[PDB]
Amino acid sequence: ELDQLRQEAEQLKNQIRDARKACADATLSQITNNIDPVGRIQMRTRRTLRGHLAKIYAMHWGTDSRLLVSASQDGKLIIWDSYTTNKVHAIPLRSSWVMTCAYAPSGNYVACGGLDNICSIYNLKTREGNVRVSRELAGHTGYLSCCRFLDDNQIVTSSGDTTCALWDIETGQQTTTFTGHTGDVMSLSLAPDTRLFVSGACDASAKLWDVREGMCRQTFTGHESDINAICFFPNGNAFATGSDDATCRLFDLRADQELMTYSHDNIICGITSVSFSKSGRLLLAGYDDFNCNVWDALKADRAGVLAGHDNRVSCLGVTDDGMAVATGSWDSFLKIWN
Amino acid sequence: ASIAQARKLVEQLKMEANIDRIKVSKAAADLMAYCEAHAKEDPLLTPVPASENPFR
Amino acid sequence: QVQLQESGGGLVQPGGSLRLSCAASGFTFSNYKMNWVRQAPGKGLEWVSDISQSGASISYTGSVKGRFTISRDNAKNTLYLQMNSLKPEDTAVYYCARCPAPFTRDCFDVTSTTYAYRGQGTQVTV
Amino acid sequence: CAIYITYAVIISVGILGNAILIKVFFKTKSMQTVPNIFITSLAFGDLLLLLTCVPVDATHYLAEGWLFGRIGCKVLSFIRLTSVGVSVFTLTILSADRYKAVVKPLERQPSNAILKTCVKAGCVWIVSMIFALPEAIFTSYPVSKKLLQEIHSLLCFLVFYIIPLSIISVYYSLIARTLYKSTLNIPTEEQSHARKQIESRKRIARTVLVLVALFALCWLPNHLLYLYHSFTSAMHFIFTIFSRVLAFSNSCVNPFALYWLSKSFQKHFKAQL
Amino acid sequence: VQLVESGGGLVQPGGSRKLSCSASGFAFSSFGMHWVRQAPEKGLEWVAYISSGSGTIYYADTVKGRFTISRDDPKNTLFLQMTSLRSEDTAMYYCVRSIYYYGSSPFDFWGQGTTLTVSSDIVMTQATSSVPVTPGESVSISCRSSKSLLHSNGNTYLYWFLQRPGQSPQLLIYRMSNLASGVPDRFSGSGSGTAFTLTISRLEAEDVGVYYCMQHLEYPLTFGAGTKLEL
Amino acid sequence: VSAEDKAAAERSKMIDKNLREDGEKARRTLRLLLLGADNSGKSTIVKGIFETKFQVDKVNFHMFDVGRRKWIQCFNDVTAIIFVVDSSDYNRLQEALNDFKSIWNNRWLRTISVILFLNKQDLLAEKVLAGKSKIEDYFPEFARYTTPDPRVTRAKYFIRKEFVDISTASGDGRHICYPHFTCAVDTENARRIFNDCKDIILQMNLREYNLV
Ligand SMILES: C=CC(C)(C)[C@H](OC(=O)c1ccco1)c1cc(OC)c2c(NO)ccc(N=O)c2c1OC
């Protein structure tokens, strides 16, 4: 009976909540109450990457920490040499509604997707000296909101059809599909070991998936509205979410519950992007009020502001050695901060 | 129908309920330990001298 | 966890009265603009009424204007819909739907097929 | 000496208007883009004109022949002439640019043309300096000035009052006709969105014609006096001071028009002051 | 990729001859194109260079004012006009493609080469010229430069080419340590700023030939004399 | 910088030039978002994404029909939103009004004007002439509504006034709605779109030029 199934589901929810409550002894703030304050964090715009003629939806850093790819709604992917601000590549797109982009760890490929429901893989290393689309991954029934390369032949995409998928670019087939979200999945983040990933959807919950197996391991709730950003802690045992209730939250996989809340009274706009520092001590979040805030992740005290964008900050990344922060925005400008 | 969806939700909740969880104090201590162990090599946390900065 | 539990529905003769309650938890009730949504048997979701964050702005669909009264209690996190002179065409399942984002007036997707911030619903029949 | 009060009031009003305009430019991020470049170039020219016109009142009023050196009273006259030229020419170019914005709206352009407008403003400054170059002698042309003085007067009158007035009048008349004809295309009825646009566009057109008339009536008397002196007291001194007051009165009008039209500028002025 | 050059042959001294190269199989418009000579029984010698879009053009000091380099992007053709040819321009002319962006591999592909017969800058001293060797024995090829090839940005602009007997040169190592695509992992490059060594861990029958060193630090590009490995 | 860095910078400058030309070519087109509904006949207005292109008076228009709180944010830089309403069916009229209100009040669509096409006026005229269906049942205010065949005229004016009241209840002039009446056989809808977009761009120029 439907009523009996609902009763069993709510009983299990109560049991899980009680287990989480029992497992909680002291909040993260109490533990990190004696930690020395991080102090004011001042970053100045080292580089301003100009050339996009429309709002920027996504950016991704290369593993070399020097090359980055940016996606813009004018149907162009631009690969920047951030040291010299030289445009290495400019990739025309079949659809100009791109809302995500990725850079392969090897650096041979970039990916993008959007309202066309397709992830396109582009080969940067061709014998013809030209960038060409390698594979087009079709099968998602909603807009692609994120994509992350696992290796040169495996990619994970989160779509607007409330599903996340793992692809095999060699054959262009969905190897496994991750289901369970009841809202549009907006972003995903891969663990350092690339065995698990976390995805945040429009149902105000994040889920931890097993790439090899293909089912959700844990579900994390606590946000009051749609989750727009997510990113792993550098050690892979935690992650931070950025949502539309003007709040960032930190979750621990082992504790399977919330850890700390990153909110302020005069912040009412939603968070569009979230990223950690190299050591995980600083959390950087992009907001709709045109600014980026730096949060002391251990103490939930704001450490700085990356003011300098005149529109919504849509993307935000940190290099693999932590030497810079690149924030793109809806004013068609990218900035490198240090 | 929605009966299959309810059964799937119940099965997922049951699979999620019976997992091991550590105390939140241990998780906080581990995050603190990582942050203090990798603090020195964080350019954003501790700014580097302009000689080694590649974005002068 | 965002939850909306509806209660107060039942069976009433035509021209009778009812009162529906929507106890809310998992979110700060004050910053959100609440709605009332119903699904007639064999029909899709229909928007019935809504109330702003403080209760200053209140709107109803023309079909139920003058018969239903919406109100909220931000202290008790409860949403109400007083019903007067029920009609045979008013039988439906009544959902309590929350606006997707706080501090905002527009409410997209409230009447969607699989909206995430809607209640289970209560059945009002005449 | 009942007229010096009006002189001081006009100079103070113009100086404060240009100061608040440039402060709004350099302080507020929202009020800083391609169209504001010509506005603030005009404000700079107005400041230079007012501050190079006040010393004439300070020195040559009563029993004070000359205070500054000959090079001083040669550089001051040059700066006054180049400020007049840059203000008038930036008025003409602003008229043209507004005409392009209004009458040809679909021909969008400014996205990275900040350098183009900056170099155009620089060219306006340079051409004003070149047109003020013939004043690099001394009162200019002390003696033996009956033909050179006459040709200088004719060319100055033409270049500074006929060509710019003609251009600004024709462009602003075209703007007025376009706005009046576009008032009809507004949804008219179903008010609170349509009638507001109608009233705003009619107000803009009226302000535009008033601007043309004010420029003409303010700048005519000074050129008339100069032409009369070039062709060949009590009442003449009053006429001269009134003519100069009218000539620089239009300077105060330049920021007031944008204050009257744009409500954003009105709020910026009310916040900054 | 394919570069074919035509226009060589016997030329009377003081005459004029035009060399044309046709590029097929790659985006010819995105590559800067070079010309390289090789007089018989002598090493290579860079001649000219035209940028992508013909924006930048360079000539060797011994050809400047007589040779003219041009490209036809719509026709994917590269030309070299030679006027007043004298009795030392007799050589085999190679067309080379080279694209420049961060991480690129210039001088990757070399044309077949056409033969023409008639009648201050960094010197790269390669010292040894012939070294006997047996297959399976590791070889080190040394190099020297008058001026340090290491730049302030950290790139040591030294290029290693191999010219097999009766074949065009092939890029082995770019910017000192980078190993070109399609090259076996046996080859390696090392050297700090002036003394460079080319290492071949295992020698096969296909590794015989003349190995050349090139500097790309400054636009008068210069080559070494070449080391010959024979069995 | 080195020789290779110089050539890389030259290639970057060539890329910059090509991007500038592409943006100049793409800035002369006007992008529109078609946001009707099923039974509204929005497809037959102008004679994944159903993109349709039309050109009148040597001005190019690009219309995007996606086939919602998240993907609607991509269309915040479009020239205008073309909202098509089936005016004959009174049952779905309230849903159309709610949809129009949601689009109008959105945070990212708060500066976009809406060209409202009240489609199928002929069917509405036939329905009101028949008299079988009364607008008063669905909309009680139509019973006490008098216009400022008269019955068809007051029905049309009430239907349009509902949407206009929604549009003018907020905005403060940052964007306005352009109501129109369409019969799904009218061939002038492209001209209406062009004139309304020209007025929208004119008002935008007036705003950005400190004239309004
Ligand atoms: C626009 C040009 C005029 C001629 C009106 C110009 O007037 C103004 O620019 C002005 C600005 C504010 C008020 O007036 C001006 C220029 C002159 O020099 C070439 C002189 C002059 N030569 O040395 C000697 C006496 C003048 N008589 O006052 C005089 C002068 O005024 C009439």
Chains interfacing with C (3 or more CB pairs < 8 Å)? A, F
Could you tell me if A296 and A22 are in contact, meaning their C-beta atoms sit under 8 angstroms apart?
no
How many helices (DSSP H) and strands (DSSP E) are in chain C?
0, 9
Q: Which of D212, D243, D208 is nearest to D229 (CA)?
A: D243
Q: Which of F121, F124, F127 is nearest to F189 (CA)?
A: F121
What SS3 string covers chain E? CEEEEECCEEECCCCEEEEEEEEECCCHHHCEEEEEEECCCCCEEEEEEECHHHCCEEECCCCCCCEEEEEECCCCEEEEEEECCCCCCCEEEEEEEECCCCCCCCCCEECCCEEEEECCCCCEECCCCEEECCCCCCEEEEEEECCCCECCCCCECEEEEEECCCCCEEEEEECCCEECCCCCCCEEEEECCCEEEEEECCCCHHHCEEEEEEECCCCCCCECCCEEEEC
Q: Give CA–CA dist C108/F99, Å, rounded.
A: 8
Question: Around Cβ F44, how many Cβ atoms within 10 Å?
Answer: 13
Q: Assess A89–E contact: CB distance below 8 Å, yes or no.
A: yes
Nearest CA owner, ligand 1 atom 22: D140
Q: Give CA–CA dist E156/E174, Å, rounded.
A: 9
Q: Which of A309, A308, A244, A317 is nearest to A277 (CA)?
A: A317
Of the candidates C62, C105, C107, which has its C-beta nearest F94's C-beta? C62
Question: Which are the residues after which chain D is interrupted (C to N > 2.5 Å)?
Answer: 138, 232
Chain B contact set for A215 (CB, 8 A): 12, 15
Find all residues with CB under 8 Å of A197, minimum gap 6, and list them: A148, A156, A164, A188, A189, A190, A191, A208, A209, A211
What SS3 string covers chain A? CHHHHHHHHHHHHHHHHHHHHHHCCCCHHHHCCCCCCCCCCCCCEEEEECCCCCCEEEEEECCCCCEEEEEECCCEEEEEECCCCEEEEEEECCCCCEEEEEECCCCCEEEEEECCCCEEEEECCCCCCCCEEEEEECCCCCCEEEEEECCCCEEEEEECCCEEEEEECCCCEEEEEEECCCCCEEEEEECCCCCEEEEEECCCEEEEEECCCCCEEEEEECCCCCEEEEEECCCCCEEEEEECCCCEEEEECCCCEEEEEECCCCCCCCEEEEEECCCCCEEEEEECCCCEEEEECCCCEEEEECCCCCCCEEEEEECCCCCCEEEEECCCCEEEEC
Element (H, E) at F22: helix F3-26
Q: Assess A202–C contact: CB distance below 8 Å, yes or no.
A: yes
The answer, yes or no, to whether any atom of ligand 1 lies below 6 A from the CB of D38, is: no
Q: Give CA–CA dist A330/D17, Å, rounded.
A: 35
Q: Give CA–CA dist A124/C41, Å, rounded.
A: 56
Write the DSSP symbol of residue F176.
Answer: -
Shortest distance, CA F59 to any CA of chain C (angstroms): 33
Q: Give CA–CA dist F84/F97, Å, rounded.
A: 11
Structure tokens at F11: 């290639």
Chain A contact set for B17 (CB, 8 A): 12, 15-16, 19
Find all residues with CB under 8 Å of D238, minimum gap 6, and list them: D3
Q: How many degrees, rounded to 5, is the angle at CA A112 between CA A109 and CA A183? A: 135
CATH fold label, E124-229 = Immunoglobulin-like (2.60.40)
Residue A277's identity, in one-letter code, is: S
Domain that holds residue A197: 2-337
Length of chain A: 338
Solved using = cryo-EM
The answer, yes or no, to whether any atom of ligand 1 lies below 6 A from the CB of D222, is: yes
Element (H, E) at F9: helix F3-26
In degrees rounded to 5, what are phi and psi of residue A16?
A: -65, -40
Of the candidates C27, C103, C116, which has its C-beta nearest A202's C-beta? C116
Could you tell me if D59 and D72 are in contact, meaning their C-beta atoms sit under 8 angstroms apart?
no
Put simply, the answer to whether F94 touches C47 (Cβ < 8 Å) is yes
Chain F: residue nearest E174 by CA? F4
β-pair partners for A274: A285
The answer, yes or no, to whether any atom of ligand 1 lies below 6 A from the CB of D156, is: yes
Q: Give CA–CA dist E114/E92, Å, rounded.
A: 5
Chain C contact set for A270 (CB, 8 A): 101
- As a whole number of Å, the CA-based R_g of chain A is 20
Resolution (A): 2.8
β-pairing, A248-252 with E130-132? unpaired
Q: Which of E63, E64, E158, E189 is nearest to E116 (CA)?
A: E63
What is chain B's percent helix, strand, coil content, to nearest 5?
A: 55, 0, 45
Put simply, the answer to whether A184 touches F70 (Cβ < 8 Å) is yes
CATH fold label, E2-118 = Immunoglobulin-like (2.60.40)
Put simply, the answer to whether A277 touches B44 (Cβ < 8 Å) is yes
Element (H, E) at C83: strand C78-84
β-pair partners for F114: F81, F177
Find all residues with CB under 8 Å of D218, minimum gap 6, and list them: D246, D247, D249, D250, D253
β-pair partners for A60: A69
Q: Give CA–CA dist E2/E21, Å, rounded.
A: 10
The answer, yes or no, to whether any atom of ligand 1 lies below 6 A from the CB of D226, is: yes
Q: Give CA–CA dist F95/C6, Å, rounded.
A: 24
Superfamily of domain D4-272: Rhodopsin 7-helix transmembrane proteins (1.20.1070.10)
Length of chain C: 126
In DSSP notation, F63-100 reads: EEEE--TTGGGGGGSSSEEEEEEE-S-STTHHHHHHHH
Shortest distance, CA D45 to any CA of chain F (angstroms): 20
**Sign of the alpha-carbon dihedral angle for A320, A322, A327, A333:** negative
Q: Give CA–CA dist D106/D159, Å, rounded.
A: 32
Q: Give CA–CA dist A162/A225, Å, rounded.
A: 16
In DSSP notation, F115-160 reads: EEEEE-HHHHHHHHHH-SS-HHHH-GGGTT-----HHHHHHHHHHH
Q: Which of C126, C102, C115 is nearest to C44 (CA)?
A: C115
Q: Give CA–CA dist E220/E230, Å, rounded.
A: 31
Q: Which residue in the block uniquely carries the two structure tokens 């470049």?
A: D37
In degrees rounded to 5, what are phi and psi of residue E58?
A: -135, 150
- What's the Cα-to-Cα distance from D35 to each of A132, D88, F101, rounded to whole Å? 41, 17, 34
β-pair partners for E160: E173, E213
β-pairing, F113-119 with F180-181? parallel
Q: Assess F164–D contact: CB distance below 8 Å, yes or no.
A: yes
Chains interfacing with B (3 or more CB pairs < 8 Å)? A
Same fold, E2-118 and E124-229: yes
Write the DSSP symbol of residue C60.
Answer: E
Of the candidates C62, C63, C106, which has its C-beta nearest F102's C-beta? C106
Q: Which of A326, A328, A222, F35 is nearest to A337 (CA)?
A: A326
Q: Give CA–CA dist E227/E191, Å, rounded.
A: 17
Structure tokens at F196: 């309304």
For chain E, positions 123-142, list CB contacts with chain F under 8 A: none
Residue A81's identity, in one-letter code, is: D
Give how many domains chain A has, as a whole number.
1
Could you tell me if E47 and E82 are in contact, meaning their C-beta atoms sit under 8 angstroms apart?
no
Put simply, the answer to whether C61 touches F141 (Cβ < 8 Å) is no
Q: Which residue in the block uniquely carries the two structure tokens 């080694």?
A: B52
**Sign of the alpha-carbon dihedral angle for A300, A301, A304, A307:** positive
The answer, yes or no, to whether any atom of ligand 1 lies below 6 A from the CB of D140, is: yes
Q: Give CA–CA dist B7/E209, Å, rounded.
A: 73
Find all residues with CB under 8 Å of D206, minimum gap 6, and list them: none
The answer, yes or no, to whether any atom of ligand 1 lies below 6 A from the CB of D83, is: no
Q: Give CA–CA dist A21/D64, Å, rounded.
A: 92
Put simply, the answer to whether A322 touches B10 (Cβ < 8 Å) is no
The answer, yes or no, to whether any atom of ligand 1 lies below 6 A from the CB of D165, is: no
Helix runs in chain D, H state only = 4-27, 34-59, 72-103, 114-132, 148-157, 163-185, 194-231, 235-261, 263-272
Shortest distance, CA F24 to any CA of chain E (angstroms): 21
CATH fold label, C3-124 = Immunoglobulin-like (2.60.40)
Q: Give CA–CA dist A116/F64, Å, rounded.
A: 12
Q: Give CA–CA dist E7/D26, Å, rounded.
A: 65
Measured in whole angstroms, the distance separating CA A57 from the mean position of its chain's CA atoms is 12
Residue D101's identity, in one-letter code, is: A
The answer, yes or no, to whether any atom of ligand 1 lies below 6 A from the CB of D89, is: no
Could you tell me if D95 and D169 are in contact, meaning their C-beta atoms sit under 8 angstroms apart?
no
